[PDB]
Amino acid sequence: MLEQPYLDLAKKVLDEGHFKPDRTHTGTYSIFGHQMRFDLSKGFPLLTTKKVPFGLIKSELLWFLHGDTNIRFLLQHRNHIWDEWAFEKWVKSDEYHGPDMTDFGHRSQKDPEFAAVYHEEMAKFDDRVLHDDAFAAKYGDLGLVYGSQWRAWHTSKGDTIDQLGDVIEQIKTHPYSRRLIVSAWNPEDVPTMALPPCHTLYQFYVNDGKLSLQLYQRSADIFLGVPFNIASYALLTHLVAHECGLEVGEFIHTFGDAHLYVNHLDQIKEQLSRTPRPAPTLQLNPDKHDIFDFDMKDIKLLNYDPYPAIKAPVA
Amino acid sequence: MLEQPYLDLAKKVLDEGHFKPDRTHTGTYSIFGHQMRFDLSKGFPLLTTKKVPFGLIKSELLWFLHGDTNIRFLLQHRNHIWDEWAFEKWVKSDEYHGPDMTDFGHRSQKDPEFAAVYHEEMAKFDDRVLHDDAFAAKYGDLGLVYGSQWRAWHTSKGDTIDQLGDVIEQIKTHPYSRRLIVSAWNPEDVPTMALPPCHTLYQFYVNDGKLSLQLYQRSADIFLGVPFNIASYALLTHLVAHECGLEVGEFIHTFGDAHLYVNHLDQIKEQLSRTPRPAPTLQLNPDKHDIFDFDMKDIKLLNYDPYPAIKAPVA
Ligand SMILES: O=c1ccn(C2C[C@H](O)[C@@H](COP(=O)(O)O)O2)c(=O)[nH]1
Ligand SMILES: O=c1ccn(C2C[C@H](O)[C@@H](COP(=O)(O)O)O2)c(=O)[nH]1
Known part of the structure; x- marks a missing residue:
């Protein structure tokens, strides 16, 4: 169904997994290079086989969009x-x-x-x-989190660039640009950084009347962290469709090391026996329109009917 | 066979192509989001159904590696x-x-x-x-070409960063890092730029004894420009394997707008009826080892047996 692309991504790592040590050697099964697409006009990619807090997803996306750190x-x-x-x-x-x-x-x-x-x-x-x-x-x-990289890139000759706010004036005035990228990777201050951005970049694209967005995730913790990442960027795809007066098409997630932390193997087998349920459908406040100055109340999830939650060991 | 991933990438655009105007409206059939893998231990991805100048590929890669502009x-x-x-x-x-x-x-x-x-x-x-x-x-x-972005990123508080030369000391001392990226996209000087980099970034990865590299190409002219791009980055994958004392695994090409310029449709149908030939095999000078101070003569292509060349209209 809609999330079926997620549950196969967890079975391929259960079959191609190279055990790879990393962490402090700690344990991983990983693949390198993977791409999964979600057609956002069927419904919203929030998992129905784990209850995922839509509340902690939008709070953080709107921190990101307000440019907050x-x-x-x-x-x-x-x-x-x-x-x-x-x-x-x-x-x-x-x-x-x-x-x-x-x-x-x-x-x-x-x-x-x-x-x-x-x-x-x-x-x-x-x-x-x-x-x-x-x-x-x-x-x-x-200091350096997504609101500061997305809405204030730091230039030599001190300015701050609004990367987001310029590719959307760019999607309003030139729908057909293949230069619509935001990059959260600055390579200067990246070794003076605790956690190098994982969503390295994403790129939007207008095909006949409709908007899509693709994401390069450099490293993704399959069980504990991708559930959440799919809906953060498929939220932002609905929100900028909102502001550009466009329609909504695809969310493409492309991946670098996609991995399964080893302490998590019994848990992801359990969700893997569950059977999808139909996914929710997101609507957004019609009458306010600049997403940058939105609040929780303008985003609602209807008919989310999840399976129960699967509690972590953490990453 | 080895290039079969290329010739299907041209047939999918011949079937999913949204006609998209761009250029000066001029004409394109495009898809958004695509990933194709080449197993570089079967042979080198230079096409056998078009003769592609391996000479103009290595001259330019070694300009890039010397850090030249x-x-x-x-x-x-x-x-x-x-x-x-x-x-x-x-x-x-x-x-x-x-x-x-x-x-x-x-x-x-x-x-x-x-x-x-x-x-x-x-x-x-x-x-x-x-x-x-x-x-x-x-x-x-x-000024701003790949040698300058790869080997001298320009910092606030004026320095230049060698991005390449630091991820290879990084692949020698920490084979298992998922932070091994080079980004050719600086978002400050990118509107003061004539051609925003197309190879936006790539990321290497060590799995059991062997090296791979994945590339995010923001826009790729399927017929006239991808033939060349596959071997430039599958050259660099063999060259850094060379210097790291490692083996060679996969080249993953991931794509943003992959397109077929419309003036090129009869020509790519012609190569599409040709049948692959076995691909060449690249060997590199054994006794010099720092790739950065290599010359043409250390890279050889054996048993390249191409079909004839297909002459352009250009992009
Ligand atoms: O929601 C999240 C949180 C974390 N990570 C990851 C990936 C790795 O497990 C770890 C980052 O480690 P490095 O890849 O940066 O080493 O955190 C995600 O992918 N998504
Ligand atoms: O070897 C090359 C040369 C050019 N391009 C492209 C892609 C587009 O056809 C054009 C760049 O246009 P924008 O995508 O930057 O508009 O050149 C490549 O992909 N590969």
């Missing part, structure tokens, strides 16, 4: 995906006096109480960001 | 592909006194003698670049 917008939308990127530098200088949280990702995972001390000093940190302009301003700002 | 290296290797990018600014100021060559690409195409005056003032220009250091230095330097 600050953990504070996400936290005051209960969406906590980016938190330890900034809870990481909290565990760094000056005011960091007290607990350990020392490359903590490792020890909460293996912990009775290392994790709860991790878990509390983190909400200490979080309801701080929510509450003082100076802490928030200092440590809640990640 | 100057029409002069290519001209003193009889390879003239980049010439009118710099013959274009010749038709610009100061010393440009005399002929017309005014967006000339158009009028030589439709010309009795507009073209020969185009054709002579161009060799005037060419054996000039070959002969004075100042003209050559001034107009034979294109």
Whole structure:
């Protein structure tokens, strides 16, 4: 059905998987080079064989579209995906006096109480960001995330480029350009970076009255991370169709290392026995139109009827 | 056989082609999103159903690998592909006194003698670049081509980054990195550019002892331009295997708008009736090893037995 392209992508790695060590050797089955297409006029690519939080997808897409870099917008939308990127530098200088949280990702995972001390000093940190302009301003700002790469590229001779906002004036005035790319990869500040962008680039395209978008994902954690990535970029494809006064066609996901983290093998076999359900259908607020100054309430998901959720081990 | 992935890519555009105007409306049949793989241990992807100049492929790849930007290296290797990018600014100021060559690409195409005056003032220009250091230095330097993007990215706080030379120290010391990308797309100087890079990026990958490379081509002229692109990047895949002391696996070509220029339809039907011949096999000089300071003589093609050539109308 609509997601069938996803569930085969997980079976091919279950058959071509080269075991590849990486991580800290930790374990992967991977393929290199894969492309899967979703026809967004049949429905929205949110999985029906795992319940995926559409709420944490739109909160983050609209952080991206507002051009935002600050953990504070996400936290005051209960969406906590980016938190330890900034809870990481909290565990760094000056005011960091007290607990350990020392490359903590490792020890909460293996912990009775290392994790709860991790878990509390983190909400200490979080309801701080929510509450003082100076802490928030200092440590809640990640610097180089997608809102800053998409809406403010940093130039020599200091400017900021709005990459997004210029390819959409470009899709309004020249529908047939093959130069409609946004690149989240700047190669200058990429070794001075903690997580090199994974959505490296995407490219839109107008065929007869309708818009599509293709994405180069440099590395994708098949089970835990692709469920979420398919709907973030098939959301943005509906939103820029919205603003360009166009119709909606295809979302093409193309992949570099597509992998299955090894600690995740029993779980993805379980969803692999489930049978699809019909996918939801997304509609968007008709009367506001500039997506950049949209809020949660203008995006709704109807008839999402998921299977239950499959809980992680994480990546 | 080995190239069979190419000839089907031309038949799918002959069946899915949306006619798309572009050019100056001029004419195209295109698809959006396509991926074709070549297993480089069966042989080299140079077409056997068109004779493709392996000589103009390696001259240009080694310009790229030397980090060169100057029409002069290519001209003193009889390879003239980049010439009118710099013959274009010749038709610009100061010393440009005399002929017309005014967006000339158009009028030589439709010309009795507009073209020969185009054709002579161009060799005037060419054996000039070959002969004075100042003209050559001034107009034979294109500025932003692949040697300058691959081997000298331009940073804020003026440096130049060697993108290539760092991912190969990276493939020698960390074979399993999914962050091995080179991007030829800088989004700052891309509207102040005549031809936005078409090979936007590529990404290498080490699976068990062997190297592969995947390429995102933003726009590719199926008949006249892909024959050449497959062997330029499947050359570079053999050359960096060479230097990393590794083996050779796959070349994955992934595509954005793959198109068939309309003036080219009878010609690509003709090659489409030909039957493959076995592809050549490339060997490289064993005893020199740093590819960056290689010359023509270290790359040889054996048993290339092509069909005849199919002459263009151009793109
Ligand atoms: O939603 C997400 C989150 C993470 N990753 C990945 C891919 C790898 O598992 C890891 C990044 O590691 P590198 O590929 O950058 O080493 O995170 C995704 O693909 N999607
Ligand atoms: O060897 C080549 C030469 C040119 N092009 C292309 C693609 C388009 O035909 C044109 C570039 O036009 P834009 O896509 O940049 O508009 O040149 C290639 O793909 N390969």
